[PDB]
Protein backbone atom coordinates (compact mmCIF):
# COMPACT_ATOMS: atom_id res chain seq x y z
CA UNK A 1 0.00 0.00 0.00
CA UNK A 2 2.82 2.40 0.83
CA UNK A 3 4.44 2.56 -2.60
CA UNK A 4 0.98 2.83 -4.14
CA UNK A 5 0.26 5.86 -1.96
CA UNK A 6 3.59 7.49 -2.79
CA UNK A 7 3.30 6.93 -6.54
CA UNK A 8 -0.31 8.10 -6.75
CA UNK A 9 0.72 11.17 -4.75
CA UNK A 10 3.61 11.99 -7.07
CA UNK A 11 1.51 11.50 -10.21
CA UNK A 12 -1.34 13.62 -8.86
CA UNK A 13 1.08 16.38 -7.85
CA UNK A 14 2.63 16.46 -11.32
CA UNK A 15 -0.82 16.54 -12.91
CA UNK A 16 -1.88 19.38 -10.63
CA UNK A 17 1.19 21.27 -11.83
CA UNK A 18 0.38 20.66 -15.49
CA UNK A 19 -3.32 21.51 -15.09
CA UNK A 20 -2.18 24.74 -13.46
CA UNK A 21 0.05 25.34 -16.48
CA UNK A 22 -2.98 24.90 -18.73
CA UNK A 23 -5.51 26.90 -16.66
CA UNK A 24 -3.66 29.86 -15.13
CA UNK A 25 -3.26 31.63 -18.52
CA UNK A 26 -7.07 31.92 -18.71
CA UNK A 27 14.80 11.01 -42.07
CA UNK A 28 17.53 8.64 -43.34
CA UNK A 29 19.41 5.99 -41.35
CA UNK A 30 22.73 5.95 -39.51
CA UNK A 31 23.88 2.35 -39.05
CA UNK A 32 26.03 3.55 -36.15
CA UNK A 33 23.04 4.28 -33.93
CA UNK A 34 21.55 0.82 -34.41
CA UNK A 35 24.95 -0.73 -33.74
CA UNK A 36 25.22 1.27 -30.52
CA UNK A 37 21.76 0.20 -29.37
CA UNK A 38 22.76 -3.39 -30.09
CA UNK A 39 25.92 -3.03 -28.01
CA UNK A 40 23.73 -1.67 -25.22
CA UNK A 41 21.51 -4.74 -25.37
CA UNK A 42 24.36 -7.24 -25.50
CA UNK A 43 25.72 -5.51 -22.40
CA UNK A 44 22.45 -5.35 -20.44
CA UNK A 45 22.17 -9.09 -20.95
CA UNK A 46 25.65 -9.50 -19.47
CA UNK A 47 24.45 -7.35 -16.56
CA UNK A 48 21.48 -9.64 -16.00
CA UNK A 49 23.86 -12.60 -15.99
CA UNK A 50 26.34 -10.84 -13.71
CA UNK A 51 24.22 -9.21 -10.99
CA UNK A 52 23.72 -12.34 -8.83
CA UNK A 53 27.31 -12.41 -7.57
CA UNK A 54 26.42 -11.04 -4.08
CA UNK A 55 24.71 -14.39 -3.48
CA UNK A 56 26.72 -16.65 -5.79
CA UNK A 57 29.81 -15.68 -3.80
CA UNK A 58 28.69 -17.03 -0.42
CA UNK A 59 28.55 -20.56 -1.85
CA UNK A 60 31.32 -23.15 -1.59
CA UNK A 61 32.47 -23.49 -5.23
CA UNK A 62 34.64 -20.40 -5.30
CA UNK A 63 36.86 -22.16 -7.84
CA UNK A 64 33.75 -22.12 -10.07
CA UNK A 65 32.31 -18.64 -9.53
CA UNK A 66 35.70 -16.93 -9.82
CA UNK A 67 36.27 -18.77 -13.09
CA UNK A 68 32.87 -18.18 -14.67
CA UNK A 69 33.09 -14.48 -13.86
CA UNK A 70 36.52 -14.17 -15.45
CA UNK A 71 35.21 -16.10 -18.46
CA UNK A 72 32.21 -13.86 -19.05
CA UNK A 73 34.22 -10.68 -18.62
CA UNK A 74 37.11 -11.72 -20.85
CA UNK A 75 34.98 -13.07 -23.70
CA UNK A 76 32.83 -9.95 -23.61
CA UNK A 77 36.01 -7.88 -23.80
CA UNK A 78 37.16 -10.00 -26.75
CA UNK A 79 33.94 -9.31 -28.62
CA UNK A 80 34.29 -5.62 -27.78
CA UNK A 81 37.86 -5.47 -29.06
CA UNK A 82 36.84 -7.22 -32.26
CA UNK A 83 34.03 -4.73 -32.82
CA UNK A 84 36.54 -1.93 -32.26
CA UNK A 85 39.16 -3.34 -34.64
CA UNK A 86 36.42 -3.83 -37.24
CA UNK A 87 35.43 -0.19 -36.74
CA UNK A 88 32.13 -0.10 -34.91
CA UNK A 89 33.36 2.72 -32.66
CA UNK A 90 34.67 5.32 -35.12
CA UNK A 91 31.60 7.36 -36.22
CA UNK A 92 33.28 8.58 -39.43
CA UNK A 93 31.06 7.85 -42.43
Amino acid sequence: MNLYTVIFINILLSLTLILVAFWLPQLPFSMKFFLVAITFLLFDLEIALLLPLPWAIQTIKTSTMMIMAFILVTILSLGLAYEWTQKGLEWTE
Binding site: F34, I38, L42, D44
Partner: protein
Protein backbone atom coordinates in the same frame (compact mmCIF):
# COMPACT_ATOMS: atom_id res chain seq x y z
CA UNK B 1 -3.05 -18.82 -9.64
CA UNK B 2 -5.16 -20.78 -12.15
CA UNK B 3 -7.15 -17.72 -13.22
CA UNK B 4 -4.12 -15.53 -13.87
CA UNK B 5 -2.39 -18.46 -15.58
CA UNK B 6 -5.26 -19.07 -18.00
CA UNK B 7 -5.29 -15.34 -18.70
CA UNK B 8 -1.55 -15.33 -19.42
CA UNK B 9 -2.07 -18.24 -21.81
CA UNK B 10 -4.83 -16.23 -23.47
CA UNK B 11 -2.40 -13.34 -23.87
CA UNK B 12 0.07 -15.70 -25.50
CA UNK B 13 -2.65 -16.83 -27.91
CA UNK B 14 -3.46 -13.20 -28.69
CA UNK B 15 0.16 -12.43 -29.51
CA UNK B 16 0.04 -15.55 -31.68
CA UNK B 17 -2.88 -14.08 -33.61
CA UNK B 18 -1.04 -10.77 -33.85
CA UNK B 19 1.96 -12.48 -35.44
CA UNK B 20 -0.08 -14.76 -37.70
CA UNK B 21 -2.13 -11.85 -39.05
CA UNK B 22 -0.59 -8.65 -40.38
CA UNK B 23 -1.68 -5.05 -40.88
CA UNK B 24 1.00 -3.95 -43.36
CA UNK B 25 3.98 -3.63 -41.03
CA UNK B 26 6.70 -5.75 -39.43
CA UNK B 27 7.52 -4.03 -36.15
CA UNK B 28 4.04 -4.96 -34.97
CA UNK B 29 4.84 -8.63 -35.55
CA UNK B 30 8.14 -8.34 -33.69
CA UNK B 31 6.48 -6.56 -30.77
CA UNK B 32 3.89 -9.33 -30.58
CA UNK B 33 6.80 -11.76 -30.44
CA UNK B 34 8.15 -9.80 -27.49
CA UNK B 35 4.74 -10.03 -25.84
CA UNK B 36 4.77 -13.79 -26.25
CA UNK B 37 8.22 -13.95 -24.67
CA UNK B 38 7.14 -11.78 -21.75
CA UNK B 39 4.12 -13.96 -21.02
CA UNK B 40 6.28 -17.08 -21.16
CA UNK B 41 8.98 -15.73 -18.85
CA UNK B 42 6.25 -14.70 -16.42
CA UNK B 43 4.48 -18.05 -16.46
CA UNK B 44 7.77 -19.87 -15.89
CA UNK B 45 8.88 -17.70 -12.97
CA UNK B 46 5.39 -18.02 -11.49
CA UNK B 47 5.46 -21.82 -11.74
CA UNK B 48 8.89 -21.88 -10.11
CA UNK B 49 8.16 -19.52 -7.22
CA UNK B 50 4.85 -21.31 -6.62
CA UNK B 51 6.50 -24.73 -6.43
CA UNK B 52 9.21 -23.10 -4.27
CA UNK B 53 11.70 -24.56 -6.73
CA UNK B 54 14.96 -22.65 -7.17
CA UNK B 55 17.32 -24.59 -9.44
CA UNK B 56 14.76 -24.17 -12.25
CA UNK B 57 14.89 -20.35 -12.12
CA UNK B 58 17.85 -19.90 -14.53
CA UNK B 59 15.49 -20.84 -17.39
CA UNK B 60 13.60 -17.52 -17.57
CA UNK B 61 16.93 -15.67 -17.65
CA UNK B 62 18.18 -17.94 -20.43
CA UNK B 63 15.13 -17.59 -22.65
CA UNK B 64 14.89 -13.85 -22.02
CA UNK B 65 18.48 -13.37 -23.18
CA UNK B 66 17.78 -15.50 -26.24
CA UNK B 67 14.65 -13.50 -27.07
CA UNK B 68 16.62 -10.28 -26.74
CA UNK B 69 19.21 -11.48 -29.25
CA UNK B 70 16.53 -12.91 -31.55
CA UNK B 71 14.58 -9.65 -31.69
CA UNK B 72 17.88 -7.85 -32.22
CA UNK B 73 18.70 -9.79 -35.37
CA UNK B 74 15.09 -9.38 -36.49
CA UNK B 75 15.41 -5.61 -36.15
CA UNK B 76 18.68 -5.70 -38.08
CA UNK B 77 16.87 -7.49 -40.90
CA UNK B 78 13.98 -5.03 -40.79
CA UNK B 79 16.54 -2.22 -41.07
CA UNK B 80 18.37 -3.73 -44.03
CA UNK B 81 14.96 -4.13 -45.67
CA UNK B 82 13.98 -0.51 -45.10
CA UNK B 83 17.37 0.72 -46.32
CA UNK B 84 17.28 -1.36 -49.51
CA UNK B 85 13.63 -0.70 -50.45
CA UNK B 86 12.61 2.61 -48.88
CA UNK B 87 10.29 1.51 -46.07
CA UNK B 88 9.41 -1.37 -43.75
CA UNK B 89 6.17 -2.37 -45.46
CA UNK B 90 5.24 -5.99 -46.14
CA UNK B 91 3.66 -5.88 -49.62
CA UNK B 92 7.06 -5.08 -51.14
CA UNK B 93 8.14 -8.72 -50.73
CA UNK B 94 6.35 -10.03 -53.81
CA UNK B 95 9.59 -11.55 -55.13
CA UNK B 96 10.80 -15.16 -54.92
CA UNK B 97 7.50 -16.47 -56.35
CA UNK B 98 9.31 -17.29 -59.60
Amino acid sequence: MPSTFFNLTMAFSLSLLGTLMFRSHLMSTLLCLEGMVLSLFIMTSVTSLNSNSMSSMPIPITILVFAACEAAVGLALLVKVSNTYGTDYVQNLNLLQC
